[PDB]
Design a protein around this ligand. Structure first.
Ligand code: SF4
Lengths: 1124, 132, 26, 374
DNA sequence: TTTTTAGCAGCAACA
DNA sequence: TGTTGCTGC
């Protein structure tokens, strides 16, 4: 009894500090034009149909943030607004959460207890009712009784949580206190709460009124915000990374709405730069006006002044969360400028740069999450090449600081190139994508850009659960340990997507392949043909057979081709190279089977349900494959390890505690299990000679069909809206071509909206495929590890069923989860058109429709139940299935690599070519990667196009082998040819270090050796350009890595370091060719030749086309045993 | 300041001579683009004299030391350029999207003369190989 | 005598457009 | 095969210029007076343009990172035989080419509006005996004839004559000049009074009859309305074509409205009705024209919705934000067709007017009108 | 403190 | 020869 007075004072102090920060934000917002608009009083009848008589002001909500108002919690909403430059408005709303009771008869005893226990922080209390999908018989309208606790602000809500958590912990471990079951909805972010509970969304238009925000629909197009995009050039030391403590800003390049600007620091930049044009395409203009400023502080002041003048509501950068803004802010602090009081920008709790009025659109966040680019193509140049379809200017980072004095015009051309690349990357891709996501997600642009996709699914599901009055579950907490057969689980999961590599080789539309058709598969297909064609009209094309004039003509044409393939079942003819892939596979399995985490019921919850009668159809049973990884050790051995650890002593992790040492039982239970797992890994390895066992167990779960439909309705509805936009897209495509060609005739509004619907299409797309993932989002809500296993095993069963047909009528090459790559005979029944009485043609792909018909006969849900009458709880039962293959192709060529191991393919690696010879799709491979060995990139650039040459598979591999031999001649001749500097570059291998410093005092290797050798010779991001030296003989490759910059150095310096690095004091020859390890480079290229060519042909049984690169000994044995 | 482009001679020669048939114009012109830097000696008169007579790799023509730096063999669209003893370049004859034009600024008389107009170019985009 | 070669640039680069002055020509 | 040789020294005079299809058509035209000409205002600062006889392109050099060698065919002065090296696929040598130039850039041509360089051209206000005044000032620059001016201007002949006529260029006593706004419109006013006083066909005017009509009863030494002045007024306020002039009547009325704004209502915001009455009364009798304060405001600004006041576009800032600031200052709330000619000067980016409008100032609508505030 | 999932290639170490 | 780690698909 001795601290009750010191907690109240700190919360008033924190609320005053938050009000003082809110005042500073109001001052900054007003400077930037975001004056706080308060709408006129209106005592009239509220109807949203008469909005134009409705009072206040209409605007599009561009930016929203949580604030504390004179403190009361509120959200400020920033409206790019129509017409106006901008204006903010505030919605106040009480933060709240719920208490759950175990006995609904004594809720009033809990009410009196919590009124009296929370009196210091509670604003108001109310008893409410919500649907809880974990409650027995909620499907009869039974609702859980809940105590709503409301607060004046989010700080008082947090104190109520601190007071209640001890009672929940006492109740769980060990009176009206024991009637408190749990707290619910206590962890929803406050701005997300206001956005959901008021249905306000960024990217949407609203009228701000006294009653709240009213959404507007007469306006689907976005407003045009003022968009700034910037980049910065800094000094740096040779071979190191710029340090904001010592290095200066040389230049800041930027674009505002399509005008270009450059600020230069004339302490560093040697000449005055004149106004110039950088237009890399006619669709990307860049006129640059130049501000030649005297010093770094004038450069910073000009940059902050120009931001205040143009009032950008978006600032975009490339990686500026982690370089640009950190640098500007540290340089500003060295010069005594406060960047928050100058322009409203500060680092948040994550260290990311944010303001109130202006959203920070780091393009690199979208590149990492949404661009679908592999991590090797996520640097600005490779994004510009892959998205904007030009090469930006490229400068070596080691030449930047020299070129500020020697060639500053060429440094300014580089800097404006990266501003142009960033601005047009933002405007063409990031802008329409993020603001489109905001129209549906209850988040601002900054959070919508930066949160993980499974958190975006969580927000969408929280909107839908709130709208249906469902009670949100608390966030799933993984159990700290689990056991299986008395063994400690290291991890548990399910069997995921099925993947097979069936063949390896070159397959070409102009080279012949052998086919061995199963005549019984053609008999099945001939017997299925009438219903498969009817299914293509009725289900795929949503038409009636009675409207189809040529149905029997198409049937007879397919029947003839099938009969000829039945009689001539062994053929050697040209292939059709096809990809067949399931449209949105996991989402469609989920909608078809009514899979949610709201239904997976136990035998208990199913037995407690009043719909559980004799004859029940609503209990759909589905299989999944669980997979444990556990320690070989048993429960007695686990207990022996625990007793051994209880005799040990542990360091206290809490730096604020004076107690340096803890016992085992004084550790947190998570820390206890970390120490147990460590000693069990050692014990298991010592006693059982293995650390883990893995086991796969087939399990069954009950999918309720009668359970409240909110999850699946979100998926069905979202799927239909996306289809809607694909349709609208097509109608718009017709509109963009039907009309006249005067491009500027008030139809550039029509094309932006085309980008817009495309973007809402891609948006629903990501959201759907994400729901599909979210559901295994550890720590998220609505988690459902099961459901995920059913979805994967059902998918694996569908794709194995499809493969088993394709293997009987053609040859499947690769299978990955939802897709099959195959070759069919060129005589196979392919594409047809049904003719309707109205002259419209419906599309038929027989290889696709034969699979879709079999999917519908085997995987349809005849148990799907939907709630027809919500007053009487009447359910209808129908047949649901949305699982369709799509077809892509035919393709010109496909190339599949083989393993060096006997009988083993290489999965998820292939190259595919279109009929025009363009590269359609690739898998694995290098080159596209940052750094790597330049020889292998140049070899890969040459080789891929040459797979389009030759009329047979052997001819194709022979053309490819010519290029392989030419690249072997360059190495076998010791590259004495060409120029020395060129040899350097190609041989060069480049590697970037993440953060040098102590990560680097840390590990040691080739780059680590190159970075240390650059340090010996001449911070974060360093490009280790190196070659591998022949000397010292028998030394590890990591000690033979020589930096290429030594070859351009003075002969005495070059001699001293080459002698020291080769361990040859007598080294007098300094030619690069006698230093190089040609054997190492010959093995690197030979290993590329094995993976990309020798394997394909030799794996398919064609003789080895590059004999100068031998096959692995397993593959030689596999060929010899295949020919015997 | 201001100055005219004189294009009368090229125009008269163009109208009086047939259309361009191969990659070389009737007046005997060719361009060339290399993805790289052509590393040549900094001096030539001294080095042209030590080249043995049999090779003739550094010849003298009208008082100017010309270096014989390669050979070109055109096979349809394909083209190959041999450089020195150790370089082989594979390339192509491509039709120019924008017909290039070479001109000539006579600083002496402040006259500008149109020299010729291109339509094709010989490009070499792959790393040089030995001549074999 | 055999010291003529091309130092290969790994990728084709086209530089920034520049304005032209009278002195740029002469 | 052809042997490729290189000289020790290249001629840097040879440069590469991109030739667009249109340039090719121009290039293959023997008809033209002037084929093509490089033009620049000065030697060290201004841009360089390429001009045909009727169009102008601005030149932009674009550097590249490659080695580009142009080879010309040559006939070796003495027979030269080369040794065969291990080179495969070599036909007999039949001609010889030498790389004579190494170029690092191309000259791109972008279409732009030609403008006259009016640096040393003085302003003429109709002063008597102006020949004396041209030596009262020290103008070293000499412009005898207009062709010399066009020759030293960055524009084509047709563009030059069009712009020269548009800005009211003339020549007095053998000295090239630019007429003041006041005296030009005064000469127009007297001319129209004489033309309608003699019942001349306003659609078929010639120089001699009108010139005779204007200077009939005034002394020649004090009659500034010379024949060249007549040619300027006709080429400014009429369209020619045996080529005769026909008056641009709506254009004349518009000019007259600009004159009225600059003389009488440039300091006060008069109600539109009184200004239209006085404006109407200033014309020479029976001149056929109707009017709208619509273009009157397309020309000035409106302090309130029913008044008009003159504004000259030349006095407006070139900084966007400042010009928008001063525009919002002239009238807190602005119309539309009223604000469009006021913002034309800020960004040639060809945009939706509303775009830059909001960019600085901001739009706000109501029932039918859209005004502009902040 | 915020955080979708599983299946697979292949380099390199060591059981 | 197999498992295990890590990066990156
Ligand atoms: S199967 Fe039927 S009775 Fe059982 S829980 Fe589901 S809806 Fe209720």
């Amino acid at each position: 009894a001795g601290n009750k007075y010191n907690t109240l004072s700190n919360n008033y102090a924190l609320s005053a500090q938050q009000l003082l920060n809110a005042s500073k934000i109001d001052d900054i917002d007003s400077m930037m034009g975001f004056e706080r608009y308060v709408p006129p009083q209106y005592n009239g009848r509220f109807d949203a149909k008469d909005i134009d008589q409705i009072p206040g002001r209409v605007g599009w909500l561009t930016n929203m943030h949580a604030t504390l108002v004179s403190g009361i919690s509120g959200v400020d909403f920033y409206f790019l607004d129509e017409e106006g430059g901008s204006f903010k408005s505030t919605v106040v709303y009480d933060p709240y959460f719920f208490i759950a009771c175990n006995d609904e008869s004594r809720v009033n005893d809990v009410e009196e207890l919590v009124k009296k226990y929370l009196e210091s922080c509670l604003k108001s209390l109310q008893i409410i009712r919500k649907e809880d999908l974990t409650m027995d018989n909620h499907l009869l309208g039974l609702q859980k009784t809940l105590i709503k606790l409301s607060f004046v602000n989010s700080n008082q809500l947090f104190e109520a949580r601190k007071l209640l958590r001890p009672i929940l912990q006492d109740n769980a471990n060990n009176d009206a206190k024991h009637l408190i079951e749990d707290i619910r909805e206590y962890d929803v972010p406050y701005h997300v709460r206001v956005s959901i509970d008021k249905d306000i969304r960024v990217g949407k238009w609203y009228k701000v009124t006294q009653q709240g925000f009213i959404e507007d629909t007469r306006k689907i197009a976005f407003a045009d915000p003022v968009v700034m995009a910037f980049d910065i050039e800094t000094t740096k030391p040779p071979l190191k990374f710029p340090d904001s403590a010592v290095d200066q800003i040389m230049m800041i390049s930027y674009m505002i709405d399509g005008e270009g600007f450059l600020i230069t620091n004339r302490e560093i930049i040697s000449e005055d730069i004149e106004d110039f044009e950088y237009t890399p395409k006619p669709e990307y203009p860049g006129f640059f006006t130049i501000f030649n400023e005297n010093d770094e502080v004038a450069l910073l002041q000009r940059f902050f002044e120009h931001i205040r003048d143009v009032r950008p509501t978006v600032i975009s950068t490339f990686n500026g969360d982690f370089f640009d803004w950190p640098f500007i802010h540290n340089r500003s602090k060295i010069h005594g400028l406060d960047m928050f009081d100058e322009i409203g920008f500060a680092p948040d709790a994550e260290g990311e740069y944010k303001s109130s009025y202006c959203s920070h659109m780091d393009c690199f966040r979208w590149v990492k999450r949404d661009s679908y680019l592999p991590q090797g193509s996520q640097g600005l140049k490779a994004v510009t090449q892959s998205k904007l379809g030009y090469n930006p200017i490229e400068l070596d980072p080691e030449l930047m600081t020299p070129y500020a004095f020697e060639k500053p015009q060429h440094l300014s051309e580089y800097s404006v190139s990266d501003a142009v690349a960033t601005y047009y990357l933002y405007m063409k891709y990031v802008h329409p994508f993020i603001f489109s996501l905001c129209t549906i997600i209850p988040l601002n642009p900054d959070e919508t850009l930066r949160k993980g996709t499974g958190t975006l699914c969580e927000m969408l599901l929280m909107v839908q659960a709130y709208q249906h009055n469902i009670l949100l579950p608390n966030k799933h907490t993984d159990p700290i340990e689990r056991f299986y057969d008395g063994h400690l689980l290291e991890s548990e999961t399910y069997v995921g997507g099925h993947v097979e590599s069936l063949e390896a080789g070159v397959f070409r539309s102009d080279l012949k392949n052998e086919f061995k058709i199963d005549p019984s598969a053609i008999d099945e297909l001939l017997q299925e043909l009438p219903e498969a064609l009817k299914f293509s009209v009725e289900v795929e094309n949503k038409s009636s057979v009675d409207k189809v004039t040529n149905f029997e003509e198409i049937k007879n044409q397919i029947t003839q081709k099938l009969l000829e393939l039945k009689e001539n079942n062994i053929r050697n003819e040209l292939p059709l190279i096809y990809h067949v892939d399931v449209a949105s596979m996991y989402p469609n399995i989920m909608t078809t089977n009514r899979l949610q985490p709201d239904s997976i019921k136990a035998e208990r919850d199913c037995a407690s349900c009043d719909f559980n009668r004799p004859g029940k159809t609503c209990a759909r049973k589905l299989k999944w494959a669980w997979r444990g990884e556990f320690f070989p050790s048993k429960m007695d051995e686990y207990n022996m390890i625990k007793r051994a650890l209880q005799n040990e002593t542990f360091p206290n992790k809490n730096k604020f505690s004076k107690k340096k040492v803890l016992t085992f039982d004084e550790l947190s239970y998570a820390d206890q299990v970390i120490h147990i797992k460590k000693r069990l890994t050692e014990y298991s390895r010592k006693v059982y000679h293995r650390v883990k066992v893995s086991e796969i167990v087939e399990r069954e779960a009950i999918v309720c069909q009668r359970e409240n439909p909110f999850y699946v309705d979100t998926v069905k509805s979202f799927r239909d809206r996306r289809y809607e936009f694909k349709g609208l897209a097509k109608t718009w495509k017709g509109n963009l071509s039907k009309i006249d060609p005067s491009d500027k005739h008030a139809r550039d509004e029509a094309k932006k909206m085309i980008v817009l619907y495309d973007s809402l299409q891609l948006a629903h797309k990501v959201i759907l495929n994400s729901f599909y993932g979210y559901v295994m989002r550890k720590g998220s809500r609505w988690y459902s590890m099961e459901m995920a296993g059913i979805t994967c095993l059902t998918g694996a069963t569908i794709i194995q069923m499809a493969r088993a047909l394709v293997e009987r009528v053609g040859r499947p090459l690769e299978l990955d989860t939802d897709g099959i790559w195959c070759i069919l005979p060129k005589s196979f029944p392919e594409t047809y058109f049904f003719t309707l009485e109205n002259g419209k043609k419906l599309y038929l792909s027989y290889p696709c429709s034969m699979l879709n018909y079999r999917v519908h006969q085997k995987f349809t849900n005849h148990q799907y139940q939907e709630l027809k009458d919500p007053l009487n709880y009447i359910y209808e039962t129908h047949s649901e299935n949305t699982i369709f293959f799509e077809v892509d192709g035919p393709y010109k060529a496909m190339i599949l690599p083989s393993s060096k191991e006997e009988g083993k393919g290489i999965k998820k690696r292939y190259a595919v070519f279109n009929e025009d010879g363009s590269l359609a799709e690739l898998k694995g491979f290098e080159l596209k990667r940052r750094g790597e060995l330049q020889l292998i990139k140049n070899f890969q650039s040459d080789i891929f196009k040459v797979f389009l040459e030759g009329d047979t598979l052997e001819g194709c591999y022979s053309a490819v082998a010519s290029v392989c031999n030419r690249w072997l001649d360059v190495l076998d001749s010791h590259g004495l040819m060409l120029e020395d500097e060129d040899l350097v570059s190609l041989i060069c291998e480049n590697r970037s270090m993440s953060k040098t410093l102590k990560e680097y005092e840390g590990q040691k290797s080739t780059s680590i050796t190159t970075a240390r050798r650059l340090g010996d010779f001449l911070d974060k991001g360093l490009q280790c350009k190196y070659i591998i030296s022949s000397k010292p003989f028998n030394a590890p490759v990591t000690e033979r890595a020589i930096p290429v910059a030594i070859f351009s150095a003075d002969i005495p310096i070059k001699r001293s370091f080459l002698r020291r690095w080769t361990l040859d004091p007598s080294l007098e020859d300094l030619d690069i060719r006698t230093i190089i390890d040609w054997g190492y480079y010959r093995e690197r290229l030979g290993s590329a030749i094995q993976k990309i060519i020798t394997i394909p042909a030799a794996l398919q049984g064609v003789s080895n086309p590059v004999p100068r690169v031998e096959h692995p000994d397993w593959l030689k044995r596999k060929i010899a045993t295949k020919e015997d | 300041p201001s100055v005219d482009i004189d294009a009368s001679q090229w125009q008269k020669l163009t109208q009086s001579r047939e259309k361009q048939t191969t990659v070389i114009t009737p007046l005997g012109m060719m361009m060339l683009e290399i993805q790289g830097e052509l590393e040549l000696p900094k001096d030539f008169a001294s080095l042209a004299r030590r080249d043995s007579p049999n090779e003739g790799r550094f010849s003298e023509q009208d008082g100017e030391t010309l270096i014989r730096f390669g050979s070109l063999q055109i096979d349809g669209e394909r083209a190959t350029l041999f450089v020195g003893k150790k370089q082989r370049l594979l390339g192509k004859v491509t039709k120019l999207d924008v017909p290039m034009g070479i001109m000539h600024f006579n600083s002496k008389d402040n006259k500008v003369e149109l020299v010729d107009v291109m339509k094709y170019k010989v490009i070499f985009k792959d790393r040089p190989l030995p001549i074999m | 005598t055999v010291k003529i070669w091309v130092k290969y640039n790994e990728g084709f680069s086209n530089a920034v457009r520049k304005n032209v002055t009278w002195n740029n020509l002469w | 095969s052809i042997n490729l040789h290189s000289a020790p020294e290249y001629d840097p005079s040879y440069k590469l210029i991109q030739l667009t299809p249109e340039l090719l058509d121009i290039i293959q035209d023997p008809v033209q007076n002037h084929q093509l000409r490089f033009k620049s205002l000065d030697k060290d600062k201004s841009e360089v343009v390429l001009c045909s006889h009727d169009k102008t392109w601005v030149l932009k050099q674009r550097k590249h990172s490659n080695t580009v060698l142009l080879m010309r065919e040559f006939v070796p002065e003495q027979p030269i035989t080369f040794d065969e090296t291990l080179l495969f696929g070599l036909s007999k040598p039949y001609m010889d080419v030498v790389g004579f130039a190494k170029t690092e850039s191309e000259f791109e041509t972008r279409e732009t509006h030609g403008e006259l360089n009016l640096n040393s051209v003085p302003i003429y206000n109709g002063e008597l005996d102006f020949s004396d005044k041209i030596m009262k000032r020290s103008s070293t620059k000499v412009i005898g004839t207009l062709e010399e001016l066009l020759e030293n201007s960055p524009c084509s002949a047709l563009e030059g004559i069009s712009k020269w006529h548009k800005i009211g260029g003339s020549v007095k006593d053998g000295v090239l000049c630019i007429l003041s706004q006041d005296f030009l419109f005064k000469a127009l006013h007297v001319l129209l009074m004489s033309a309608m006083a003699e019942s001349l066909d306003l659609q078929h005017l010639n120089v001699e009859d009108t010139h005779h009509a204007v200077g009939k009863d005034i002394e020649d030494e004090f009659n500034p309305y010379t024949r060249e002045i007549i040619e300027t007024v006709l080429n400014k306020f009429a369209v020619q074509e045996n080529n005769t002039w026909r008056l641009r009547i709506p254009f004349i009325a518009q000019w007259y409205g600009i004159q009225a704004l600059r003389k009488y209502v440039s300091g006060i915001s008069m109600p539109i009705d009184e200004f239209l009455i006085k404006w109407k009364s200033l014309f020479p009798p029976f001149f056929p024209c109707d009017i709208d304060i619509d273009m009157l405001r397309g020309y000035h600004f409106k302090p309130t919705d029913k008044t008009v006041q003159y504004i000259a576009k030349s006095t407006l800032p070139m900084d966007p934000k400042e010009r928008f600031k001063v525009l919002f200052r002239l009238q807190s709330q602005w119309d539309l067709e009223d604000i469009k000619p006021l913002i034309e000067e800020l960004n040639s980016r060809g945009m939706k007017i509303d775009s830059f409008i909001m960019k600085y100032a901001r739009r706000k609508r109501l029932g039918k009108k859209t005004v502009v505030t902040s």
